[PDB]
């Protein structure tokens, strides 16, 4: 009677700000067990030395003081152990956020002809996390650039694209890069932009300068595609899917340069086309969108308890767009490559088992405990039935299923005589006893013996035999016209000790007699101790058919059928 | 805009205690209507005078002062009238509870031989409500007789039956009758009972003296059956069904002399047998239990509004164990004999209609209002579609459904020319227009005119015709082995204004492309403006079959199929 280690908290991927006020980085790991568990940690698939005046432990959590990329960056995972086995936590990656300021060198001036679009390169500084948000400031820091059809800011390159340049756009433009992971924002030095005036602005055809390449995205994620063009007449951008309908969860946005898809499905895979139009010309661009899916469990493993010597199959099934591979760990070490199947299970197999399902994109863990039971045969839970009722000429099966672990051997003895396999007497291996073509000499006391490696068990039962239930008078077929009265006769013989009932069925279907419609034309008039007749009034065409009377008792049932024809 | 009278509160059967403290009896009747209703009352199928001083009116409720059996007891019902018709309330019976005290005459003494059962007659006084409860007192009023297997108290006759008489039974016995309806209790004069002692008492066989006759009871009601026998050895009573199982909601009780059935079903109909046993002999008694069911609505009528000249069918359906008869009243007077059906409805038919469903046991009312509408044809709610899309050689139907009462006449005009019934052009009577084998000359502006007895209406619409979508290159049948790559080709021609899609189906079922299983072997590949091919990888036996490519657009769809054979 114990409790294996179960993971409550597992470490997650973490990024530590380089300039954080706190000098400590903590990874969380916590587990439950009946004997208090022991926690261990591993770094880059290698053991981590304890003490050293750097690492510290806080109830299973690993704390590092003044971490340096040259020392701590990498993969950590946690191990929870006890007297019943070990369990491994999900691998967690620890990295450090990096973001330097822009170079303080002055930016050169840029002159642009009015009516000609231009591109401004942000050239962001060095950074470790690539989840950067880009904006642009005008003249002063508090000022920001509004998103229009002429002005576009790429979220990948970080550049600023102006389709049409006018005198109103003149001024100093600076880039602004923010990282939310490290919460650090920096702006570049301002670039003066001067538009040379023109009296006869020249039109330019639409040219797509911001394109979106082939993108692999996961199911359920939010995906954004960018497409932008330049030209003297403000170009219009339209999105469409190739010979297919656009996904329902699609937002073109007001600007028309960004396409957002929420909770992408497997159907959305294919080509997407962005078309830019103006008065002078037009352009088209096609891109590939591939859809993938993280591994998701179908039948995850649960704490299981099995008997000794019994073959065991654990169903571990996961589904993903790329067929995921299945792995099996035992106490934190590789054990199986998929479809774990055990034979002649013993105490050695018991422990903690972990099924991993991993594709090329993600991996999911499932933890469980396998316990082994060793028990002597006992009939306390499912004892033998005191009285069993049987009839002559009918096969009878007596169940003797005890609670035993190693699947013990079964024997049957008729009180003072031992039974063996015979023609009409059969002992199948599940423990029950079969008797065919029964006679009154068969009734008596039967004892079921179960012999096991650990102990033996004996159970007693009594079987009594009664006369079979048969039908003396069967119903006679009849033919009548519409609107006449019909009578169906049924009389049965049974054992007085047993209770007999009569059930009428029409064309293979039992009549319920609980609906008002059936009572109109059908009535049951059971009389005497064995007479069970049926009356039909105001017969109709649909009433004609097969009527079967069944005498039913607790041991067997006997049926006799007849036909009723209705003419007009 | 009017509103007919609708009943909120209806009078119920009432019993008034003869010696009540309050001297007024009130019957409640309430209805709502847009013109405030007028209330009338009827007594014993006859009008009741409003000015009698005894009677008074309180907001539609009828109050009676100092009611007397000879004058006021009987059947009352309420009538709610207005400018739109009359409605009748459910008939309510008003009766007066009656219970006089016992006669003060002394009761003679009764001597009984020990070992012989006896019967004590209550002789209850006159009473109007028959829901009497019987008990018995010994010597003093607070003392009561407990019900045992020897002592039984009938709830119908009210007598006390003693199966075995002993010396302890001597004493004075008085009957006690209570009525819950009037909450009145009275006890009779005491009867002295003296048992003559006997030595070596001889046993007597069991004789059933309390029997239960054939009983008709309604579905869902509570049924009680009484059976009791007498004899020197205290007899045991058992209840059973002849050739069927006893109802689940059956309680035999501790005494064994009363059988209780709760929420009786239609199945409980049949014979019930009571068996009394002792040492000397036994006895059996059979009785018939018949089950009935009150009328219950299936599709009761509701306030309905219909147009003029339209045939009307009123569905009024009720179900009961005895087939209920259906009657139709109009404004409180007989109108129809069942299944009311009206043709060429006019203003005269509008009013208040009452469907009654009554069997031999109960009756159910259903009140409703039938309104008739006369309206000029209008296209405000369902105007003509501004733009209609069609294809060459394809049949097209243009819907012109106005809101008009007498089903007006319809005409169609191509702007300046009137259309008539033709070979390819047919104008059916519902108002829509059908065109077959359409050509480019057919496209244009069509006007639907609706001429009615009351006014006319004109609606305008524009129908544009486009080229049909067909398949230039059809898929080619292919035969391959398992594990091979197959390509199915499909190319279509369509009108550039319309948007075209491609749908692939396998063996008459469209492929969803939303399940991970389909993506394993199927890859849909679309290119250009008309190329839509499909790729099958790692073919299996189950993949072989019929593949159909369907080019689908807003106007029509064109399909082409092919076959794929798999070997190996
Ligand atoms: C034939 O006999 C049966 C059985 O006696 C009657 O049916 C019972 O009627 C009583 C009331 O007359 C019901 O009791 C009520 O139960 C309500 C809750 O119903 C649920 O819970 C009960 C008990 O577990 C279930 O049986 C039932 O199916 C439901 O699941 C309570 O809310 C009621 O309380 C209110 O009314 C009582 C009335 O005395 C007040 O005292 C309370 O203060 C409160 O206002 C009430 O207790 C009972 O549930 C019904 N069924 C059964 C099986 O007992 C038939 O009415 C009766 N028919 C005829 C024609 O005689
Ligand atoms: C221009 O051309 C159009 C198209 O042919 C005509 O529209 C037809 O109008 C006639 C009436 O003049 C319609 O005939 C009637 O149709 C009724 C509805 O039929 C449907 O429902 C029945 C129900 O059983 C179906 O069996 C049937 O297949 C339909 O689905 C019928 O109920 C009518 O039956 C009888 O009614 C009277 C009653 O006395 C008899 O006198 C009749 O002779 C008839 O036996 C009747 O058949 C016809 O249905 C309309 N066409 C279509 C396609 O529905 C226009 O009338 C014609 N002229 C003008 C000016 O528009
Ligand atoms: C956008 O970038 C442009 C870059 O060209 C920038 O233009 C410069 O602005 C400064 C600030 O106004 C200018 O410097 C001034 O020039 C005027 C005209 O010559 C002088 O009168 C000013 O003198 C005052 O300030 C001096 C500061 O030392 C004092 O010493 C003096 O006593 C006066 O108080 C001042 O020198 C500069 O000429 C322009 N142009 C260039 C090429 O630098 C612009 O300001 C930026 N911001 C915008 C446009 O919002
Ligand atoms: C007395 O008679 C009974 C009644 O037959 C007998 O019980 C039988 O035992 C045999 C031996 O195991 C059972 O046969 C097996 O049953 C299991 C469960 O269904 C099957 O999985 C087995 O299939 C394998 O074995 C076959 C060869 O037996 C192979 O050909 C097959 O390809 C499989 O590899 C096998 O069929 C049999 O089912 C029972 N009978 C039952 C359950 O009704 C008993 O052994 C006899 N002797 C005694 C009691 O001393
Ligand atoms: C993708 O965006 C949707 C936006 O709806 C996210 O769904 C939730 O939307 C509600 C809107 O009120 C937000 O309050 C929630 O915070 C959103 N998230 C969740 C988990 O509920 C969705 O989560 C986004 N998915 C990703 C992967 O970013
Ligand atoms: C078929 O039997 C039924 C049931 O008896 C007959 O219906 C009624 O039966 C009662 C029996 O007491 C008679 O009093 C009625 O006169 C019978 N008729 C009706 C209409 O209720 C039924 O009549 C019998 N069949 C025929 C063809 O008469
Ligand atoms: C059928 O075509 C598919 C698609 O071209 C082939 O898939 C290849 O799969 C392997 C393993 O994932 C990739 O490395 C290859 O790149 C895929 N092919 C191409 C062209 O990229 C598949 O092998 C083909 N099978 C047969 C029997 O021809
Ligand atoms: C394990 O328990 C979960 C609890 O919801 C259940 O969904 C799952 O089916 C169980 N495992 C198996 C193999 O049934
Ligand atoms: C059956 O087992 C019980 C133990 O529970 C034992 O007392 C009894 O003697 C056994 N019967 C035999 C061996 O016949
Ligand atoms: C019954 O009444 C009689 C008549 O007065 C009396 O003699 C006798 O004692 C009474 N019995 C009991 C038990 O009080
Ligand atoms: C009639 O109205 C009642 C409610 O008043 C509703 O329960 C019933 O379903 C309605 N039946 C029809 C046919 O509209
Ligand atoms: C349609 O009817 C309206 C009034 O009902 C009228 O003003 C209009 O001129 C009519 N149009 C045609 C085309 O008859």
Per residue, the 3-state secondary structure of A186-215, as one string, reads EECCCEEEEEECCCCCCCCCCEEEECCCCE
Q: Which ligand 5 atom minimizes the distance to the CA of A221?
A: 27
C-alpha–C-alpha distance, residues B11 and B22, integer Å: 19
For ligand 7, say whether the CB of B485 is within 6 Å of any of its atoms: yes
Q: Which pair of structure tokens corresponds to residue A266?
A: 């497997």
DSSP state of A520: H
User: Which residues make Cβ contacts (< 8 Å) with residue A420, sequence separation at least 6?
Assistant: A427
Contact between chains at B244 and A321 (C-beta distance less than 8 A): no
What part of A 276-305 touches B (C-beta under 8 Å)? Answer: 293
A70 CA to centre of own chain: 40
Query: What is residue B99's DSSP assignment?
Result: B
Q: Count CB atoms within 10 A of the CB of residue A347.
A: 10
Cα A332 to chain centroid, rounded: 24
B265/A514 Cβ within 8 A: yes
Query: How far is residue A559's CA from residue A470's CA, in Å, rounded to a whole number?
Result: 8
Take residue B454 and report the two structure tokens written for it.
Answer: 């009351």
Pick the residue from chain B with its C-alpha nearest to A321: B516
In chain A, the N- to C-terminal Cα span, in Å, equals 78
CB atoms within 10 A of CB A134: 18
- Please, how many CA atoms are within 13 Å of residue B296, restricted to the half-sphere of its CB? 10
Residue B376's Cβ-side half-sphere holds a number of Cα atoms within 13 Å equal to 7
Provide the token pair at B17. 């205690």
Cβ of B428 less than 6 Å from ligand 2: yes
Rounded to whole angstroms, how far apart are CA atoms A537 and A428?
52
Q: Which residues pair with B6 in a beta bridge?
A: B32
Closest by CA position to B83, among listed B163, B15, B5, B195: B5
Alpha helices (H) in B416-542, listed in sequence order? 516-521
A264 in the Ramachandran plot: left (φ > 0), alpha (ψ -120 to 50) or beta?
A: beta
Please answer whether residues B477 and B561 qualify as being in contact, where contact means their C-beta atoms are separated by less than 8 angstroms. no
Do the chains contact at A266 and B319, CB–CB below 8 Å? no
Would you give the DSSP letter of residue A348?
Answer: G
Of the candidates A230, A237, A239, A234, the one whose C-alpha atom is nearest the C-alpha of residue A209 is A230
Assess contact for A453 and A447: CB atoms under 8 A: no
Token code pair at residue B498:
């319309």
Nearest to B293 among A269, A319, A516 (CB): A516
- Quote the ligand 5 centre to A363 CA distance (angstroms): 23
> How many whole angstroms separate alpha carbon B337 and alpha carbon B355?
10
β-partners of residue A526 are: A532
Q: A292: left (phi > 0), else alpha (psi -120 to 50), else beta? A: beta
SS3 A363: strand
> Is the Cβ–Cβ distance between A221 and A137 less than 8 Å?
no
Distance of CA A496 to the CA centre of its chain: 58
> Would you say the C-alpha torsion A322, A325, A326, A332 has a positive or negative sign?
negative
Q: Is-contact B488 B534, C-beta < 8 A?
A: yes
Q: Does A520 touch chain B (CB under 8 A)?
A: yes
Using an 8 Å Cβ cutoff, are B404 and B431 in contact? Answer: no
Distance CA B185, CA B175 (A): 11
d(CA B484, CA B181): 90
Residue that is written with structure tokens 């999900």 in the block = A90
Cα A452 to ligand 9 centre (Å) = 14
Opening angle at CA A539, ends A534 and A542, nearest 5:
105
Rounded CA-CA distance A451/A407 in Å is 9
Q: Residue B293: its chain A contacts at CB < 8 A?
A: 516
Residue carrying the six token digits 């972990």: A354
With an 8 Å Cβ cutoff, are A526 and B266 in contact? no
Distance between CA atoms of A501 and B1, rounded to whole angstroms?
A: 63
CA–CA separation, A120 and A479 (whole Å): 100
Estimate to the nearest angstrom the gap between the alpha carbon of A404 and the chain centroid: 34
Q: Is the dihedral of CA B319, B325, B330, B335 positive or negative?
A: positive
CA A452 to chain centroid = 41
Distance CA A550, CA A545 (A): 16
Which of ligand 1's atoms lies nearest the C-alpha of B221?
A: 60
Per-residue burial over B408-441, b if 16 or more Cβ lie within 10 Å, else e, is bebbbeeeeeeeeeeeeeebeeebbbebeebeee
Compute the radius of gyration of chain A from its Cα atoms: 42
Distance CA(A77)–CA(A29), nearest Å, equals 9
Mode of pairing for the β-strands spanning A318-319 and A296-297: antiparallel
- The region that residue B132 occupies, defined by phi over 0 for left and psi between -120 and 50 for alpha, beta otherwise, is beta
Termini Cα distance of chain B? 78
**Could you give the CA distance from residue A32 to residue A10 in angstroms, rounded to a whole number?**
12
- Contacts of residue A302, Cβ cutoff 8 Å, sequence gap at least 6: A368
Q: Please name the helix (run of DSSP H) or strand (run of DSSP E) that holds residue A519, with its range, or none.
A: helix A516-521
The structural domains of chain B, ordered by start, are 6-97 (2.60.40.10), 110-196 (2.60.40.10), 207-292 (2.60.40.10), 296-373 (2.60.40.10), 387-466 (2.60.40.10), 470-567 (2.60.40.10)
HEC string for A456-514: EEEEEEEEEEECCCEEEECCCCEEEECCCCEEECCEEECCCCCCCEEEEEECCEECCCC
Contact A125, A101 (CB under 8 A): yes
Sign of CA dihedral A152, A153, A157, A161: positive
How far away, in angstroms, is B349 Cα from ligand 11 center? 22
Structure tokens at B483: 């594990």
Paired tokens of B204:
């007597």
Atom of ligand 5 nearest to the CA of A262: 1
In angstroms, what is the span from residue A193 Cα to ligand 3's centroid? Answer: 16
Chain B residues in contact with A293 (beta carbon < 8 A): 516
Top mutation candidate among B169, B171, B191 for ligand 10, by most atoms within 8 Å of CB: B171
Whole-number Å distance, alpha carbon A376 to ligand 4 midpoint, is: 24
Ligand 9 centroid to residue A461 C-alpha, Å: 14
- Residues with Cβ within 8 Å of B380's Cβ and at least 6 positions away in sequence, in order, are B403
Q: Is the dihedral of CA B69, B74, B80, B86 positive or negative?
A: negative
- Which tokens sit at A234? 């403000």
Chain B residues lying within 8 Å of A520, measured CB to CB: 323
Report DSSP state, residue B205: -
Ligand 1 contact via B221 beta carbon (within 6 Å): yes
Q: How many whole angstroms separate alpha carbon A438 and alpha carbon A424?
A: 8
Within 13 Å and on the Cβ side, how many CA atoms surround B520?
Answer: 14
User: What's the residue count for chain A?
Assistant: 568
Question: A526: which chain B residues are within 8 Å (Cβ-Cβ)?
Answer: 242-244, 270-271
CA–CA gap between residue A78 and residue A61 (Å, rounded): 9
Q: Is residue A188 classed as helix, strand or coil in its secondary structure?
A: coil
Token code pair at residue B296: 């219950």
Measured in angstroms, the CA of A513 and the nearest CA of chain B are apart by: 6
* Cα B197 to Cα A333: distance, rounded to the nearest angstrom: 96
Torsions phi, psi of B552, nearest 5?
-120, 130
Which one of A240, A243, A552 makes the best mutation probe of the B interface by having the most chain B beta carbons within 10 Å? A243
* Rounded Cα–Cα distance for residues B33 and B48 (Å): 24
> Which of A239, A296, A516, A553 should be substituted to probe chain B, the one whose Cβ sees the most B Cβ atoms within 10 Å?
A516
**Which atom of ligand 4 has the smallest separation from the CA of A421?**
1
Query: Chain B residues with CB inside 8 Å of A501's CB?
Result: 243-245
| Reported resolution, Å | 3.9
Across the interface, do B526 and A270 touch by the CB < 8 Å criterion?
Answer: yes
Give the closest residue to B370 by CA, choosing from B388, B386, B349, B385.
B349
Task: Give the DSSP H or E segment for A521.
Answer: helix A516-521
The experimental method, as deposited, was X-ray
Backbone angles phi, psi at A348, to 5 degrees: -65, -35
Inter-chain contact A519–B321, Cβ cutoff 8 Å?
A: yes
CA-to-CA separations, B274 to A484, B226, B240, in angstroms, rounded: 35, 9, 7
Nearest-atom index, ligand 8, CA of A300: 11
Q: Which site among B243, B295, B490, B500 would you substitute to test the A interface, given the most A Cβ atoms closer than 10 Å to its Cβ?
A: B243
Separation between Cα atoms, residue B43 and residue B193, nearest integer Å: 51
CA distance B384 to B398: 8
Cα–Cα distance between A111 and A118 in angstroms, integer?
10
DSSP B541: G
């Amino acid at each position: 009677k114990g409790f294996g280690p179960i993971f409550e908290e597992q470490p997650i991927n973490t990024i530590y700000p380089e300039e954080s006020l706190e000098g400590k980085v903590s990874l969380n790991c916590r587990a439950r067990a009946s004997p208090f568990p022991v926690y261990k940690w591993r770094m880059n698939n290698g053991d981590v030395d304890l003490t050293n005046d750097r690492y510290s432990m806080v109830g299973g959590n690993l704390v590092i003081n003044n971490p340096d990329k040259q020392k701590d960056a990498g993969v950590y995972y946690c191990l929870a152990s006890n007297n019943y086995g070990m369990v491994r936590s999900t691998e967690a990656t620890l990295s450090f956020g990096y973001l330097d300021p822009f170079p303080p060198e002055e930016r050169p001036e840029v002159k642009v002809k009015e009516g000609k679009g231009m591109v401004l390169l942000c050239d962001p500084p060095y950074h470790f996390p690539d989840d950067l948000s880009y904006r642009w400031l005008l003249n002063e820091f508090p000022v920001f650039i509004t998103m229009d059809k002429r002005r576009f800011v790429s979220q990948t390159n970080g550049n600023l694209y102006i389709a049409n340049v006018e005198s109103s756009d003149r001024g100093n433009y600076s880039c602004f890069v923010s990282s939310p992971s490290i919460t650090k924002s920096v702006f570049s030095k301002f670039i003066p932009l001067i538009p040379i005036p023109e009296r006869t602005t020249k039109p330019y055809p639409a040219d797509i300068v911001v394109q979106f390449k082939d993108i692999y995205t996961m199911m359920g994620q939010n995906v954004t595609l960018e497409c932008f063009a330049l030209g003297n007449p403000v170009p219009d951008i339209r999105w469409r899917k190739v010979l297919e309908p656009m996904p329902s969860t699609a937002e073109i946005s007001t600007s028309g340069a960004v396409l957002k898809i929420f909770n992408i499905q497997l159907e959305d895979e294919g080509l997407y086309e962005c078309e830019a139009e103006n008065i002078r010309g037009k352009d088209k661009h096609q891109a590939r969108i591939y859809v993938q899916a993280f591994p998701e469990w179908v039948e995850h493993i649960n704490d299981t308890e099995v008997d000794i010597g019994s073959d065991l199959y654990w169903p571990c099934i996961a589904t993903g767009k790329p067929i995921p591979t299945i792995r099996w760990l035992k106490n934190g070490y590789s054990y199986h490559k998929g479809e774990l199947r055990l034979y002649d299970v013993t105490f050695e197999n018991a422990g903690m088992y972990q099924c991993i399902a991993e594709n090329a994109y993600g991996s999911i863990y499932a933890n469980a405990e396998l316990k082994i039971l060793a028990l002597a045969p006992t009939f306390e839970m499912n004892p033998m039935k005191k009285k069993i009722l049987a009839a002559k000429g009918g096969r009878v099966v007596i169940e003797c299923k005890p609670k035993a672990a190693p699947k013990p051997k079964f024997s049957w003895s008729k009180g003072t005589e031992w039974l063996v396999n015979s023609s009409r007497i059969l002992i199948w291996e599940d423990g029950s006893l079969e008797i065919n073509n029964i006679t009154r000499n068969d009734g008596g006391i039967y004892t079921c013996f179960a012999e096991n490696n650990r102990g033996k068990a004996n159970s007693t039962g009594t079987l009594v035999i009664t006369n079979p239930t048969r039908i003396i008078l069967a119903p006679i077929n009849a033919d009548i016209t519409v609107g006449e009265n019909a009578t169906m006769q049924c009389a049965a013989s049974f054992d007085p000790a047993l209770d007999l009932t009569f059930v009428w069925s029409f064309n293979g279907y039992v009549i319920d007699f609980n609906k008002e419609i059936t009572h109109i034309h059908y009535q049951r008039n059971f009389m005497l101790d064995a007479n069970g007749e049926l009356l039909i009034r105001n017969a109709q065409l649909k009433h004609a058919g097969r009527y079967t009377c069944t005498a039913q008792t607790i041991v067997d049932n006997s049926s006799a059928s007849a036909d009723l024809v209705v003419r007009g």
